[PDB]
């Protein structure tokens, strides 16, 4: 739970920072809104889930989680500077802003949720949050870089 408060809170920041992102908001907004969805179920477990023993594995997941977040938050933060975005799109740093995160951040929930199902016995679904972040991230990536180029920042 020690990490949960860091993940949930960060889930709000990653969401607040992305919500206020001056660039690539399309994907950014998703990262946070999607991230929030990952912290959402926890809110029912960690907050009102009646107890929650953070085993060595559980904490390790939430650890990877809280850390994985810093990636999204860091990616959204490092991208906050338009100078970085404009130079990342045309240059294509990684083809997608927080793709590596949706990729790492995702696996975390897979290990965090699957662990919780054991430690807390809480029923979970295949990332109900919608692990399609990557599919939309790239769709918005190739579209973003190609959008801001000459198309109005929709």
UniProtKB/Swiss-Prot annotation:
The record marks 86 as: Target of necrosulfonamide inhibitor. Signal peptide: none annotated. Residues 55-84 form a coiled coil. Residues 1-149 are annotated as: N-terminal bundle and brace (NBB). It is found in: Cytoplasm; Cell membrane; Nucleus. The modification Phosphoserine is found at residue 125. Phosphorylation by RIPK3 induces a conformational switch that is required for necroptosis. It also induces homotrimerization and localization to the plasma membrane. Transmembrane segments: none annotated. Belongs to the protein kinase superfamily. Interaction with RIPK3 is species specific: human MLKL only interacts with human RIPK3 and not mouse RIPK3. Upon phosphorylation by RIPK3, undergoes an active conformation. Pseudokinase that plays a key role in TNF-induced necroptosis, a programmed cell death process. Does not have protein kinase activity. Activated following phosphorylation by RIPK3, leading to homotrimerization, localization to the plasma membrane and execution of programmed necrosis characterized by calcium influx and plasma membrane damage. Homooligomer. Homotrimer; forms homotrimers on necroptosis induction. Upon TNF-induced necrosis, forms in complex with PGAM5, RIPK1 and RIPK3. Within this complex, may play a role in the proper targeting of RIPK1-RIPK3 to its downstream effector PGAM5. Interacts with RIPK3; the interaction is direct and promotes its phosphorylation and subsequent activation. This is Mixed lineage kinase domain-like protein. It comes from Homo sapiens. The chain holds residues 1 to 154 of 471 of the full protein.
